[PDB]
Amino acid sequence: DTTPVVVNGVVFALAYNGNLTALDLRSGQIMWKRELGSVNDFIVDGNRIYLVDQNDRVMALTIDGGVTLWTQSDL
Amino acid sequence: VDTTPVVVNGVVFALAYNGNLTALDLRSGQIMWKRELGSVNDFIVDGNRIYLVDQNDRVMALTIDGGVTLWTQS
């Protein structure tokens, strides 16, 4: 998932190395960054970002600080 | 070729690997129309039309409801 997504002045972008970054669209200043592993896809919805990796581990993070809300890995 | 389906007005559009396009009724899965024409690679939908592009960059406009070709340009 390499096309950047923009919601409310904030850019969410995924690097190949599983780095997920939230930036201010105007300045490019990083609001938050999470170092993850093997993230294949993500989506922004309401107050959360939902991610999954190749291991079918699914996470939710806050849209504000990229803070982990929950993790599901027993799929 | 993008394989993920698109839904517009209760109509599902799905492109297969071979460039075959299918339009199905969303509620029943009932096939409305199919075009096994060309190597279509991409499409975009608006109000009543779906626009297909092929490998040769040819563009065809079809109606969403009937799969009727309104025009083609190459």
Add this chain to the structure above:
Amino acid sequence: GGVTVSGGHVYIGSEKAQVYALNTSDGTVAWQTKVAGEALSRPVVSDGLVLIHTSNGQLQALNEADGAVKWTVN
């Protein structure tokens, strides 16, 4: 893979021909359905249905509430 969100559910398809609905609140499994093949596209949600296009060339619609297969085509 692929992940989408609708109606208090996170939907995810897997290579293992499984589709999961987790609750957006806590990530607990709402439901789990075996599909016709490798689910290698984002699930697409519309009108209470979760559409799954498989590498198998199948197109299935699963109920949003319980994950039951409403219809299967192709």
Add this chain to the structure above:
Amino acid sequence: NLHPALADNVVYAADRAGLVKALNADDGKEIWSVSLAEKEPALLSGGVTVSGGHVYIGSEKAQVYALNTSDGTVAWQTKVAGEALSRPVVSDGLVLIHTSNGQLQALNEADGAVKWTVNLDMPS
């Protein structure tokens, strides 16, 4: 060859060789047609994205083009950090480009100047 776009009843379509065209959505008549070669192909890959009287297209030669919707002439052309394989995203007067070598760049819609560059790969 690339992802086509639709804006104000005009279909904008491009191919890898560099052919970009704009067609009336009603009857398919060609409003304009233009080539971004060169002979030597332009290798268009990222696009097409339409916004602000501009058609934005990225290429494998690390270029981002802005064409005028009016006549298909090149409004601007910007050297980016790596191959522009994704669709440009437009927001708040900025064109966002994710390059194949992990850079995220925001370019001005008006003149294509890179306003900022972030290394997404960087360990942090």
